[PDB]
Amino acid sequence: DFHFSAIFQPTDPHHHQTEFAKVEGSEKYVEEVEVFGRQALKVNPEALTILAHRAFSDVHHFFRKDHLEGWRRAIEDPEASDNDRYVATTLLKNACIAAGRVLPSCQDTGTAIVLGKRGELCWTGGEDEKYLSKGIWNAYRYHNLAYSQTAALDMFKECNTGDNLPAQLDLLAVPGSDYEFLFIAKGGGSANKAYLYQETKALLNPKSLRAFIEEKLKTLGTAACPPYHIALVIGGTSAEMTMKTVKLASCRYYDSLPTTGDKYGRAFRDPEWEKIVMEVAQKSGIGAQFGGKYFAHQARVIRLPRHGASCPVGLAVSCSADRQILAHINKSGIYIEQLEQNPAQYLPSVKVDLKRPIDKVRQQLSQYPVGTRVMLNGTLIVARDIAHAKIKEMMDNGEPLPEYMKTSPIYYAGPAKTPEGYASGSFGPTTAGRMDSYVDLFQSHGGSYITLAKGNRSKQVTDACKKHGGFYLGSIGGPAAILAKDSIKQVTCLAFPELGMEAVWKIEVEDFPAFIVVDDKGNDMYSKTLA
Amino acid sequence: DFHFSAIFQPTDPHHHQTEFAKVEGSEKYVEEVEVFGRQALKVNPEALTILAHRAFSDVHHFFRKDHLEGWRRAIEDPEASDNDRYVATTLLKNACIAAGRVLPSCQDTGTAIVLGKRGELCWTGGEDEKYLSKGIWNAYRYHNLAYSQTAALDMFKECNTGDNLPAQLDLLAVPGSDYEFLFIAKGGGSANKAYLYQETKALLNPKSLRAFIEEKLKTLGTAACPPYHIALVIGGTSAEMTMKTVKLASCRYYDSLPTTGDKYGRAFRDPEWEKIVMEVAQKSGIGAQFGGKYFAHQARVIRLPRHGASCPVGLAVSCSADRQILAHINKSGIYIEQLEQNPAQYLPDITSVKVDLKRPIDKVRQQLSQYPVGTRVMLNGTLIVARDIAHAKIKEMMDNGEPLPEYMKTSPIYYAGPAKTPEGYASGSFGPTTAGRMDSYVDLFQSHGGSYITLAKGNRSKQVTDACKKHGGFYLGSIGGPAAILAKDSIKQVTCLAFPELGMEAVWKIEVEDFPAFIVVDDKGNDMYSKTLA
Numbered sequence A: 001d002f003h004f005s006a007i008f009q010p011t012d013p014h015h016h017q018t019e020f021a022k023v024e025g026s027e028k029y030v031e032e033v034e035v036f037g038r039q040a041l042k043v044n045p046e047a048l049t050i051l052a053h054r055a056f057s058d059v060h061h062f063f064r065k066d067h068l069e070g071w072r073r074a075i076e077d078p079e080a081s082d083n084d085r086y087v088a089t090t091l092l093k094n095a096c097i098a099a100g101r102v103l104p105s106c107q108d109t110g111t112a113i114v115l116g117k118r119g120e121l122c123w124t125g126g127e128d129e130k131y132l133s134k135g136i137w138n139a140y141r142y143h144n145l146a147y148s149q150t151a152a153l154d155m156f157k158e159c160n161t162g163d164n165l166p167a168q169l170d171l172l173a174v175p176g177s178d179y180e181f182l183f184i185a186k187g188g189g190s191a192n193k194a195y196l197y198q199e200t201k202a203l204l205n206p207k208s209l210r211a212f213i214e215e216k217l218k219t220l221g222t223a224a225c226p227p228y229h230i231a232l233v234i235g236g237t238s239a240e241m242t243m244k245t246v247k248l249a250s251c252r253y254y255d256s257l258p259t260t261g262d263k264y265g266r267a268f269r270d271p272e273w274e275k276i277v278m279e280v281a282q283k284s285g286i287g288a289q290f291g292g293k294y295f296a297h298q299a300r301v302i303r304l305p306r307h308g309a310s311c312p313v314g315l316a317v318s319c320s321a322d323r324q325i326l327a328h329i330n331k332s333g334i335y336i337e338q339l340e341q342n343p344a345q346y347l348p349s350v351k352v353d354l355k356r357p358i359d360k361v362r363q364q365l366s367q368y369p370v371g372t373r374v375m376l377n378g379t380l381i382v383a384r385d386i387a388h389a390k391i392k393e394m395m396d397n398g399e400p401l402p403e404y405m406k407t408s409p410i411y412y413a414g415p416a417k418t419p420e421g422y423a424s425g426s427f428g429p430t431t432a433g434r435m436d437s438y439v440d441l442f443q444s445h446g447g448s449y450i451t452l453a454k455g456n457r458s459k460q461v462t463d464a465c466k467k468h469g470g471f472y473l474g475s476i477g478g479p480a481a482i483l484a485k486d487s488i489k490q491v492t493c494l495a496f497p498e499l500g501m502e503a504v505w506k507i508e509v510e511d512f513p514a515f516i517v518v519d520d521k522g523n524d525m526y527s528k529t530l531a
Numbered sequence B: 001d002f003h004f005s006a007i008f009q010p011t012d013p014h015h016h017q018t019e020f021a022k023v024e025g026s027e028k029y030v031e032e033v034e035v036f037g038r039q040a041l042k043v044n045p046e047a048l049t050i051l052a053h054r055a056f057s058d059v060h061h062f063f064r065k066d067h068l069e070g071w072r073r074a075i076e077d078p079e080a081s082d083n084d085r086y087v088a089t090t091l092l093k094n095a096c097i098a099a100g101r102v103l104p105s106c107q108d109t110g111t112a113i114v115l116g117k118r119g120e121l122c123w124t125g126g127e128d129e130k131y132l133s134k135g136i137w138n139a140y141r142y143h144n145l146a147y148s149q150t151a152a153l154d155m156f157k158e159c160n161t162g163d164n165l166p167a168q169l170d171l172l173a174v175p176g177s178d179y180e181f182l183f184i185a186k187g188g189g190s191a192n193k194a195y196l197y198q199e200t201k202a203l204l205n206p207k208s209l210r211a212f213i214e215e216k217l218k219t220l221g222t223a224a225c226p227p228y229h230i231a232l233v234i235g236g237t238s239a240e241m242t243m244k245t246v247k248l249a250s251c252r253y254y255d256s257l258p259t260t261g262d263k264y265g266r267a268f269r270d271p272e273w274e275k276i277v278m279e280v281a282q283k284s285g286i287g288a289q290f291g292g293k294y295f296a297h298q299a300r301v302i303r304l305p306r307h308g309a310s311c312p313v314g315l316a317v318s319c320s321a322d323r324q325i326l327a328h329i330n331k332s333g334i335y336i337e338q339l340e341q342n343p344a345q346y347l348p349d350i351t352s353v354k355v356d357l358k359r360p361i362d363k364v365r366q367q368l369s370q371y372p373v374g375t376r377v378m379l380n381g382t383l384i385v386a387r388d389i390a391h392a393k394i395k396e397m398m399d400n401g402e403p404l405p406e407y408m409k410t411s412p413i414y415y416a417g418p419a420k421t422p423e424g425y426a427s428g429s430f431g432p433t434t435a436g437r438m439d440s441y442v443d444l445f446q447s448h449g450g451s452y453i454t455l456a457k458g459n460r461s462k463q464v465t466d467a468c469k470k471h472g473g474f475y476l477g478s479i480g481g482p483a484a485i486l487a488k489d490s491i492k493q494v495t496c497l498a499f500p501e502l503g504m505e506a507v508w509k510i511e512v513e514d515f516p517a518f519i520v521v522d523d524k525g526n527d528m529y530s531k532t533l534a
């Protein structure tokens, strides 16, 4: 006989485990009514604007408890490495700066993602996407955030939309008369570490699955600013369903799922395999960015039903800029998840002068092995994805490598907007691996001998630095607000201003910490843990 | 100033270009009302059961015009290869059988996927998932389909749910008072060929993108029964959004999108790069399964906005079992897309080695050894049928010290499974499965004296070529997709031999006549895909 079984059966479908604050006076935006014998809710769509504005403001200055607790755990664990503690201490201090509500916790203030669940009898007037987008527009326009969205004018010609729109608006039809939300300000760096695998029954035994996990976790590397929230989804009804689930798992949205399967194919969380993921993460030695135990905060593993011929698998992380906020609108008004406003309660090198010919800097760096902590003082030239592409194009047309690529270390980065009275907006490093295809080319043409970013890099960069006498320095990844507040003293746009954050910048820095990751001798700080 | 721009802006948002039929009398399921000055539609949720039942029945017996036209193009194009025309003719003949409404067009009757868009003022009572699931349940229970969903009792212990549930139910909240739908009966073989790539700005120039397309199309191989509808999505706001878009693009759901971008980042279809995908597909020589021009029916290329640090890319196909149906409920009742009920009108107005399998297996190996890869054979006699779960069970037995069972050494091994048997028929639809999923067993089984001759569809990995060379083995490629005509014409008797508890994935002993295949891998190191899928 027929038995309906929903795939997802959370025991806490409305997230009662989360603490919410009500927006003062917001009961004026709602009215409970009774139509055709059923309870309904009229919602003034301005409530969606107010809510989205607040969610995408608060989320850049505060974190959840389970995120902050992980950084404290890395500081207090006797088994953590010195680098584990240094990175976690820096990120907590960064969070203390961000909680001042001026600088966002990361320069990458993310794609605006809205998961909405509108009850059958929740009546907004239907213009939900417009009103939500206006609230998002307000948050990014009137706060010191960043405009990160790139519009395609044709297949290859692009421009920044200038307002961080469009958002991703996933609005679902569900029972009842409320409106429930998960807002995510998703960094590009962790978005890029969402992976889909197409597997078979041969994966589905303990030995094969553990080897698979070990292999795939290494491909995350340090490129998305660990410690990670690691989410793994085994199965799914389609690739897109597997990937949506792994995103939500990484947001801890499915934490109240059952922990056992049944003959109807319901989804379940697997604590036994979450523990195995954490054991792999810890024993990997990758650590919180620079070697150690704290590759991962925590793990979520969800097992899904599958077509008998199929085994899609999803792997994704939430990065140091762990940014999501639950919310709901009901007959009492607008409620928004309460994040931690006092992160401070969780708190328990070689000097390199850049103000010289770059060959003198290269010579000093050559005296030290990979793993050495350095403090940089002087000028950095800032350039990432589009600027690198433009410069390669110039040289392909016979033009010289620009002077500003040959005088100073190249910082792969872009700033968020500058607060009034401040020298710099949040201004941390971007993922180095995206620039790997340029390094040998630029070095063979006399520049980019020293680069500064975050994340492990491919072997071609190690070979290039050895061939050309180059270096790759790894900044701590994630602490964009304290870097801006403490290290960055002057910021000037050098070239391609139309590129927004991706313009070429000239910045003057003091006490800028980094590690020598790749030297000029073929050595790589990550060669043992991320081989 | 603020300007709202929806990412997707189809010029035909309600699919007026699609022909719909009204379910007779279905206006009795709806009622127009007005509350708070606004027009609303009350919908008896039984309408969802009725609609889902008809959709997931019709779609297994009929195809859209653009799919059938693609097969006719492969028959009539002077540039099509001889194998292109043979494969396309076989698939059209299969569709004519399926149009008899008894046998489904493929044995893999798919995952039931529902994209629903419920208007703000469309009131169903809210139990949409249950009522849709009951209609899907009716369709798979009361027709000659298959129960394809595998429940996980724990991480590794599995069972079939026995009713092709759960469905994928993606119900969206949208303006208005109607209920619009796209139903997809998605085969596992093409679902497995949905790929996500994490790329960068370094990809986004003509030379790199063309090279990328060339490289990735080859990784599709023939594993999902081409000619393909190829969908390529460049960009996206997240991996899951990119993959949903490429799925819908493969269903031709986004055909009316704009063809140019703008400063607000709207999605667009790119006809120039669709033409490039088609050129790449055609010049690949991969062909409609066995070499030629018709690797692809058509292409869809959607360009999406992206975070500046990101460039997700999606690639996906719709296979020969191209199965989707649009539908909507409005004030006039239930409307469902009209598919083509007379596929025979696409067939034109107007050479193989006979292989007797009823000989010792070593005599069959000897005869096959006389011929080069690419030789078309006609098989007559016994096949032993086993795919994913049976292979895993047998390897598990061997790991525990048991011998390879005798029934794995007497006849060629057909990787396949049947749909339910129609009353009075020898077999339900019973076509081949994707061979590549069994690649890890071949060398092991051949080292223990069996599986010397395998029969399935799709190109295989190099380890299979090496095993067949080491052990004097062969891989025969059945045409992929024509499950109904294989069942009606070739498969004469089906008996369950072992592991009856595995259901569809039991070991079967079947007798076949005039079963066509190509020698894909011989016993000499040759592989008919070695040049096109190198």
Ligand code: SF4
Binding pocket: A106, A107, A108, A186, A187, A188, A189, A190, A223, A224, A225, A319, A320, A321, A428, A429, A430, A477, A478
């Ligand atoms: S820089 Fe690091 S912390 Fe910030 S969004 Fe990118 S991956 Fe996340």
Ligand code: SF4
Binding pocket: B106, B107, B108, B186, B187, B188, B189, B190, B223, B224, B225, B319, B320, B321, B431, B432, B433, B480, B481
């Ligand atoms: S056997 Fe071929 S046609 Fe049938 S569902 Fe699988 S890939 Fe599609």
